[PDB]
Design an enzyme around this catalytic site. Structure first.
Site, PDB file in Angstrom:
ATOM      1  N   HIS A 115      43.172  36.782  40.008  1.00 32.03           N
ATOM      2  CA  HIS A 115      43.189  36.275  38.610  1.00 32.03           C
ATOM      3  C   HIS A 115      42.503  34.907  38.521  1.00 32.03           C
ATOM      4  O   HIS A 115      42.948  33.984  39.227  1.00 32.03           O
ATOM      5  CB  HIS A 115      44.631  36.230  38.093  1.00 32.03           C
ATOM      6  N   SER A 151      43.235  32.958  30.685  1.00 25.71           N
ATOM      7  CA  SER A 151      44.156  34.068  30.820  1.00 25.71           C
ATOM      8  C   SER A 151      44.187  35.091  29.687  1.00 25.71           C
ATOM      9  O   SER A 151      43.151  35.561  29.227  1.00 25.71           O
ATOM     10  CB  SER A 151      45.036  34.096  31.810  1.00 25.71           C
ATOM     11  N   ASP A 177      41.495  40.752  40.389  1.00 24.60           N
ATOM     12  CA  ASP A 177      42.539  40.356  39.404  1.00 24.60           C
ATOM     13  C   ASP A 177      43.547  41.502  39.247  1.00 24.60           C
ATOM     14  O   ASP A 177      43.114  42.637  38.972  1.00 24.60           O
ATOM     15  CB  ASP A 177      41.890  39.965  38.072  1.00 24.60           C
TER      16      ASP A 177
END
Length: 410
Positions: free
Chosen positions: A377, A255, A349
């Protein structure tokens, strides 16, 4: 703005889960909770469904009162901790471990997306307490290490708290590779811990560290160079652990962690065999246009406000005014030589733009890339297989990535 990014007019479509917690639960969270995967690692639907039902009856929704919100989880979190304590006293090691980690999961979600109230800050401390009690009772116990922040400057914390797991036969005579896991905006060392037993089973040490302005990171929030000092302290500590081969350290950023994994491939090139950015950003993640849209997209809560808080800004506008200084393009990072870099993300994403994979590939040395078309994502689940396959090749491991991945679901 609708013409600026790869996903085009997708940025203008508000996600249904922002309407209410009921919509968050029914359309996004119930499924991964049932499956026992992020953000519900170590967790059980048996624990969360009762809490979800009570939150839905209250009709909680954006804008959330984080004290009101967090308090809904505490009765269940406390119940699970009390069961764990009783099991521990009875010598029920495996049971105590399970219930401490189940308690840690409930406390965790109570302080998602990031602790922004006193009860959420409380839930972080309580969650770490029961996490480490549970971790201590694992067959191969995961421990907290408070790494001296020797590279820290004025205003920074004195330690970098990390998870540490060393495979049993590891020694200075037979040292093992180490995967340094860099955690994200909401998932901290108590979450990404779920990867450690898998690596241990493949003869690989793990260290798990939080990014600046999250968990217990000692780093200055607003200083773009603060991560650089943190990794110097962490890598100095790993170098001191002679059972770890310091020529085989692989940094895997998850992330927002992906930004830090990409950055440190440059800042700490000579100390890292490789870095991986999974669903990371670099440049456009700091754009006014991206940040002014991302609060209402795939992220469960308010991504841009949460990101602003993590960077030490009181509101989104104040962050956007200065956010350009965190760009790996603007600050000159991407012009520097890098160690081996693997970039993986879903094209679609809506947390960080795939456009930042392009910026990463447009500057300095060639980088390894896998794009996952038609996924948002992190490009799951194929992204995990791509990354493990590559690390297994890099480190000369058994290549049994299916066996490793099966250990993730709770």
């Amino acid at each position: 703005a609708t013409e600026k990014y790869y996903i085009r007019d997708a940025i203008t479509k508000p996600a249904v889960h922002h309407e209410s917690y009921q919509k968050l639960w029914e359309t996004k969270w119930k499924k991964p909770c049932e499956m026992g995967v992020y953000p519900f690692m170590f967790g059980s639907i048996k624990d969360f469904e009762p809490v979800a039902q009570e939150i839905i009856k209250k009709g909680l929704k954006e804008p959330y009162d984080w004290d009101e919100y967090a308090q809904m989880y505490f009765p269940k979190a406390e119940e699970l901790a009390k069961i764990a304590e009783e099991a521990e006293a009875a010598g029920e090691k495996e049971k105590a471990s399970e219930y401490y980690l189940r308690s840690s999961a409930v406390y965790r979600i109570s302080r998602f997306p990031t602790p922004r109230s006193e009860k959420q800050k409380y839930a972080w401390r309580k969650g770490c307490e029961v996490f480490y009690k549970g971790a201590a009772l694992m067959e191969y116990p995961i421990k907290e290490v408070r790494i001296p922040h020797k590279h820290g400057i004025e205003g920074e914390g004195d330690v970098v708290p990390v998870n540490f797991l060393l495979p049993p036969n590891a020694s200075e005579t037979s040292p093992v590779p180490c995967v340094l896991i860099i955690t994200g905006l909401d998932g901290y060392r108590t979450e990404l811990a779920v990867w450690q037993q898998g690596w241990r089973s493949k003869g690989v040490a793990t260290v798990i560290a939080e990014i600046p302005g999250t968990g217990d990171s000692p780093a200055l929030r607003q200083d773009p160079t603060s991560p650089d000092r943190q990794w110097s302290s962490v890598l100095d500590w790993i170098e001191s652990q002679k059972a770890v081969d310091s020529k085989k350290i692989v940094a895997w950023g998850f992330s927002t962690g992906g930004y830090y994994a990409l950055r440190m491939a440059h800042t700490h090139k000579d100390r890292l065999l490789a870095t991986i950015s999974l669903g990371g950003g670099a440049h456009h993640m700091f754009d006014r246009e991206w940040l002014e849209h991302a609060n209402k997209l795939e992220y469960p809560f308010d991504l841009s406000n949460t990101l602003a808080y993590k960077f030490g800004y009181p509101d989104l506008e104040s962050f956007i005014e200065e956010s350009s200084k965190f760009s790996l393009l603007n600050d000159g990072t991407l012009q520097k030589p890098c160690t081996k870099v693997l970039l993986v993300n879903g094209n679609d994403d809506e947390i960080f733009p795939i456009d930042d994979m392009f910026v990463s590939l447009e500057n300095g040395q060639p980088k390894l890339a896998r794009m996952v078309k038609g996924k948002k994502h992190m490009g799951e689940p194929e992204s995990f297989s791509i990354i493990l396959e590559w690390i297994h090749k890099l480190l000369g491991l058994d290549g049994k990535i299916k066996e490793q991945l099966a250990m993730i679901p709770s």
